[PDB]
Copies of this chain bind each other. A is one copy, B any other.
């Protein structure tokens, strides 16, 4: 028993972290097979960030300008190319520690683990959610770019995020492993602002099901609702709309607990309109939106009577 924000074991990803240096700029790279992936702003100086012409800066650099280090070993760069906002450095050696992996682009609301790194070395691991405004509420300092977000499926590592930068509100922006930013952000020093952040409704519902499994049922009511009706109320409280794919995803929890998804939507609707009145849910005064239905399922391990 017990629920916790759990990250995946980081071992498979730690064996892929390298340090990439270009001039005086150092950040983290990801060594998979004979390729090192890293943010393209490694080729920039502080002055270049004001409006960098990346094609032009890359053209002026050669393989010898990249210093890739994997511990006390230098990796010889054989080729280099840019794919969107990521730099790919072909090295002469294939990483012997390369796990089974794939690159995936995640949707807002989905979670992943972050292995925060500095100088090619891991500092810590934590669980994050991709926000509806395409930012992440992470913990990153200068030198953390190149750090990746991932999930593990059996023994396959799915890389879904590479860190690039921090927005003025203290949230983080990055790309998938194909170099494409999540959201409307650019790797240029300009005034950028994240859109209005919204609550991940499907995860609040999953968390209300976790509370029901753990014995917290004060918020439950004998009422039901209709999908569009709920979405109109939720929209007013800055909650994301609940799609039919979200309802399908909540199916296993709904079946186990015997509480239909739309009955839980009516309980959430009452909570939004009346508040919690000093009461808590799972030892929390606020509704949690970074705990997915999958986490609730795998941590409960309950049976579904039919």
Of the candidates B11, B121, B170, the one whose C-beta lies within 8 Å of that of A2 is B170
Bound-complex Cα distance A212 to B119 (A) = 26
Q: Are A11 and B5 in touch, CB under 8 angstroms?
A: no
Closest approach, in angstroms, between the C-beta of A10 and any C-beta of chain B? Answer: 5
Which residues on the B side are within 8 Å of A122 (C-beta)?
A: 9, 11, 304-305
Q: A interface, by DSSP: helix, strand, loop or mixed?
A: loop
Can you list, as one digit per residue, whether each of A13-30 has a CB less than 8 Å from chain B (1) or not (0)?
Answer: 011000000000000000
How many identical subunits does the complex contain?
2
Partner of A6 from the list B6, B124, B286, B306 (CB cut-off 8 Å) is B124
Is A102's beta carbon under 8 Å from chain B?
no
Q: CA separation between A121 and B143, bound complex, in Å?
A: 32
Q: Which residue of B lies closest to A216 (CB)?
A: B170
Q: Does A46 sit at the interface, judged by CB under 8 A?
A: no
A122-165 CB mask vs B (1 if < 8 Å, else 0) is 11111000000000011111011000000000000000000000
User: Is A173 part of the contact surface with B, judged by Cβ < 8 Å?
Assistant: no
Decide yes or no whether A116 CB sits under 8 A from chain B: yes
**For the complex, what is the distance from the CA of A140 to the CA of B6, rounded to whole Å?**
11
Question: Residues 164-179 of chain A: 1 if any B CB is under 8 Å from the residue's CB, otherwise 0?
Answer: 0010001110000000
List of B residues within 8 angstroms of A5 by Cβ: 5, 126
State which of B14, B299, B306 has its C-beta within 8 Å of the C-beta of A9: B14
Given the known A-B contacts A143-B302, A286-B285, are A4 and B121 also in contact in the complex, defined by CB atoms under 8 Å? no
- Residue A303 interfacial (CB < 8 Å): yes
Other A-B pairs beyond A2-B138, A117-B304, 12, CB < 8 Å: A1-B140, A1-B141, A5-B126, A6-B116, A7-B7, A7-B126, A10-B125, A11-B11, A11-B14, A123-B302, A141-B300, A280-B286
